[PDB]
Design a protein around this ligand. Sequence first.
Ligand SMILES: C1=CS/C(=C2\C=Nc3ccccc32)N1
Ligand SMILES: C1=CS/C(=C2\C=Nc3ccccc32)N1
Ligand SMILES: C1=CS/C(=C2\C=Nc3ccccc32)N1
Ligand SMILES: C1=CS/C(=C2\C=Nc3ccccc32)N1
Ligand SMILES: C1=CS/C(=C2\C=Nc3ccccc32)N1
Ligand SMILES: C1=CS/C(=C2\C=Nc3ccccc32)N1
Lengths: 210, 210, 210, 210, 210, 206
Amino acid sequence: GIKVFGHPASIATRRVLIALHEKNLDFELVHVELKDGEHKKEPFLSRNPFGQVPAFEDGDLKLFESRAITQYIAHRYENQGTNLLQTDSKNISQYAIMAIGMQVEDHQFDPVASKLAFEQIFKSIYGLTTDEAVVAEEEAKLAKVLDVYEARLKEFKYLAGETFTLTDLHHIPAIQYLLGTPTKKLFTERPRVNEWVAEITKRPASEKVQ
Amino acid sequence: GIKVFGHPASIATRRVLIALHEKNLDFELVHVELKDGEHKKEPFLSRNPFGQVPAFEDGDLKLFESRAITQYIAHRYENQGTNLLQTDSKNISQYAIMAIGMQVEDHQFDPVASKLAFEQIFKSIYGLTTDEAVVAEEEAKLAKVLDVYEARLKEFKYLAGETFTLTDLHHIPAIQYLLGTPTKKLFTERPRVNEWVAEITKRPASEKVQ
Amino acid sequence: GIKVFGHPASIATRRVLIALHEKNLDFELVHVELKDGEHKKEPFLSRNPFGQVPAFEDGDLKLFESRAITQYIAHRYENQGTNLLQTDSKNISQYAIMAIGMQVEDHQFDPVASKLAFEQIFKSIYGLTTDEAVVAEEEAKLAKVLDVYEARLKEFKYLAGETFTLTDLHHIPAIQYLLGTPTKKLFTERPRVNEWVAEITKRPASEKVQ
Amino acid sequence: GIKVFGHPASIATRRVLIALHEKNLDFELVHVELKDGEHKKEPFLSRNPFGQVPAFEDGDLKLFESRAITQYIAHRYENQGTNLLQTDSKNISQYAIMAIGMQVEDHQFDPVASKLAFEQIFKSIYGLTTDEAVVAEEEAKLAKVLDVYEARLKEFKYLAGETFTLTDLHHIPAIQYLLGTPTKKLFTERPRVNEWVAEITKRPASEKVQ
Amino acid sequence: GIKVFGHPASIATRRVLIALHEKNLDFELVHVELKDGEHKKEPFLSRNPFGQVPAFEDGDLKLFESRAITQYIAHRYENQGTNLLQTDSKNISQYAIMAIGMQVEDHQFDPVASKLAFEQIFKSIYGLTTDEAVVAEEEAKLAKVLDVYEARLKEFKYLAGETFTLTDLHHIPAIQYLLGTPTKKLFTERPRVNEWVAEITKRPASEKVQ
Amino acid sequence: GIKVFGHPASIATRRVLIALHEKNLDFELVHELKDGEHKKEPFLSRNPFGQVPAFEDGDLKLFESRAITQYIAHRYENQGTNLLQTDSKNISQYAIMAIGMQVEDHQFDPVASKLAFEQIFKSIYLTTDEAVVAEEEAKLAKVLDVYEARLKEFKYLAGETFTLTDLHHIPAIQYLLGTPTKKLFERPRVNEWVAEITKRPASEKV
Ligand SMILES: C1=CS/C(=C2\C=Nc3ccccc32)N1
Ligand SMILES: C1=CS/C(=C2\C=Nc3ccccc32)N1
Ligand SMILES: C1=CS/C(=C2\C=Nc3ccccc32)N1
Ligand SMILES: C1=CS/C(=C2\C=Nc3ccccc32)N1
Ligand SMILES: C1=CS/C(=C2\C=Nc3ccccc32)N1
Ligand SMILES: C1=CS/C(=C2\C=Nc3ccccc32)N1
């Protein structure tokens, strides 16, 4: 069957889990003990030689890298559950529009957002002091990025068009984490972003991985 | 027709240009004067609100972000010139394998490679001193990455399988730059990588953008 | 009764838990949801205005800061379970010797060790890439620190003298995490350090918090 | 007799010197020539293997690490001069309160304050340019920390209660340095902090080390 | 004859080219292919062992380092074209005044200005994201520096006195680059600076290298 | 007369003091960075960038150490040691000296000063960063190899005579000699050069 080799707290792992749930699919979440360094030793390195979670299995097919896995799910299980591709899924122009947003989340949003979530949650869990200077710097960054998102969301219900797609889905785990932190201010202060956040984080598949 | 709004030295712009040439397509390269800050002002911000090159046009369709653009080219002009997708282009498993590698270039290769190319070439052009410490740090990184590439290339002719694909194409511009620098050692000292580099950089479409 | 307001993965929280277990004390571990930003909001800020875990309660007495809490435990519940102070607990010279080591763990060991554990474990769990350069830098640091520990442990069974004390206890949570990482090499390669690590990590109270 | 092995400009050394003076004790200040790298060679490494000042001697007893030394002084010479412990010195609850504050100075105050003092004073002495960006970053930090101090000092005359203690003493050397810098603004602009600074820096023992 | 071994985009190379043009001299600009790492290999290392552009030749005389080369030009070809030294060129007091300004450009202006120009232009050309935080930090710096320039220019037509000298010349290439960036605001907002910029950048020799 | 407004521990201030001593000149060393004097008036009227040293020779008001040493070298040329080239008006030979001066400022000083600071000045007040030390030592090593090659062809950096080019290195080198970085200075012709210039009476006075 389908197996996800990861960790339930992992943003990348959650990104995959949401897509599976969105597709009403049954799978086994095989826990990788990162705490014991399992990810940096065999046999996990045979599933992903870069030693990051998640790795993935669908029968004989062996994948890693979360965005590639969500895409695979979106296509292989297209007719099942929520459509994660564009309504007209074979339309090349419309796919490109979606692809740009996917690309934007990876390059503009994730690095900043993940740094924020890490400085202000994960640090605190393990026992290091949050760097207020870093937080401020990255908040200023994310603010400028979210202004671009606001403009985009003023012209379309979701980022790739009129429907919820992979483009939106990929943001969810990081946003979830940032909503338990003062950085929520940036999402809330922007009307169309705030509505978008609220719609995508309130989805049942999104709540299943919290 | 087709317009590319970018700069001929730009890695991301070159990534798009190679794909166009590989597809034997005719296009106009519209030069964006980054030197005069054109990219950070209208009307370029209407083509890409994040203010990076390249932006792209195919008739009425307006894109940005290089990897999204190359994918669009690969699909919209699939029949034409070199096949940039997998031989069996509609096969979902085989697409996923390609998608992983595309993902790997973006996350594991590009950040390190670009930093190297920048510290060693672009700094020198302008007049800043190369940081020998940074170079060494990143070379150690890229080495570990390229070992994973060696292992992969021992099992397959190219990164996504038996054929040259987008996965390989996306590496070219950065590699081109690094070949004029002592970092070439890392590519040469690895047999299957060295052959792979040599095959992809010697392609006519790759040379047209040097 | 006794309540610990923290998180079970937290190094500082574990430091307190071990001292409680070592004293055979009964307590409630009240989970603080850092993931929902509980620590940076009231009413937790009334228990610790710097918004870090753990906070602590012993009836009416409200404390924070792990080393202060372990000291309090060591004194208030002195006659009970393991002695965490020096054998001659009222001896001022012997206390000072212990105090130096406590001070050393805080200043020389913890910052480096925690950075290591964070770069290698906690980063991987959330989905950020380990910085191999940082790991190397800090491993070189810890090595130099652990050489000083080796010399010290060659003259005494434990760090403060012939008995296990707070000085040793405070190191445990960080060491536990580092034992599931290639940084174990540094502890193992040093004979008396390795014996010391093995003795303190194998204690029942130490294992209860793993 | 009593020897302090250090340097008169050293914050950590001054911390010890103030405690000795506060206790009306006689001692020899043995100057360590850090300029000639004395601290990183024998025989100083036999007094402190981590090669930092100050080291300390009280007859046969050999100590290092300033906070451990001040605590030792506070206890060994308890009935002499100023009481540096709590009025009810054997009270375990009241000690813990003091211990928290000691812990807070070390973790929250000292790293920021010392960076400030270093960027603004020590850099200028030797001939490096002050980084205005760093100054600003750290001033923002210290401000937030000092707000917590303000709140605390609104409820108590000194940090550990109604009396001057080690908790307060340990702040003095760093504060002295910062008072000759625009960072004084942060101390002055906060009423109860300003009163506290003025009281502790005006003490005769505090002036003796300026 | 005279040869300049450099690159036309290089600030340091331009600094030399302007001085040559200002002196109406004929020379060959020999292009060093930094892109192919020519600067870090022989035979260029025989012209400058630190591997930076520009190197320089005047018959048998072999020089490197731009400010030394411009000085050499200013003296060796003193009676030709524009006077780049002070009107009373042998006056030791007046030379010292010029020398201070030359020193000021190197230490106070260039490092900041070059970072700005690099973060905003050169990064964008090659494909890295501008760090807005860095930009802001350095803009604050340059502003303070330019206030000192404003005060100076209120008392004198140019930086070294009543005439255009090397002191002014050396600023040109960096200023040229910054004029195509929002950092122009800092120059425009200061009256005497703005006039100075406008005069020196509008000189025919300055325009020849744009 | 001549005043130097600085601090005796300051590298830049020492650079000026050595040049004055080398020229057998009499001056007053006017001393408080500790009380933030450098960042307030009236010092800002002597140097608006708020760094030491500032300098006075009668009515003439200077700042910036390399500019001051050059001024000394020229205004008091016939007095004491010659700090310019033997043929002081020769434009080719001046340029050779100027390159070296430029090299010290750009290639040597930033690295050397970071080293001296991480290893000495930090310790006087903060923990030395062993990683930084190593990074910068690798840098300085490469720089000093270039110096070795240069010193193999000439007695001093600008030619056959001791000049400003050499002088400007002294204060930083002095500090680095009390530190394990001395090891790097393992380079024969560099070692001899360091020994000659640091043993000079004017060098020892500061
Ligand atoms: C696709 C065409 S234009 C576009 C976007 C334009 N602004 C965006 C912000 C977030 C995600 C996507 C966009 N995406
Ligand atoms: C697709 C399935 S496994 C895999 C790879 C496994 N190692 C790789 C290195 C570079 C690019 C791709 C890979 N790619
Ligand atoms: C107490 C007196 S001397 C001393 C130490 C001397 N070296 C140490 C290394 C780790 C912990 C403690 C020490 N501790
Ligand atoms: C002890 C119980 S609560 C507490 C503090 C609560 N806020 C503080 C700020 C500086 C030093 C100590 C404190 N100290
Ligand atoms: C020479 C004596 S004071 C002085 C300057 C005082 N402020 C300046 C700013 C830019 C260039 C030179 C100066 N130059
Ligand atoms: C002048 C022509 S070549 C040259 C140098 C060539 N290498 C150097 C190292 C330190 C100082 C000067 C030089 N200086």
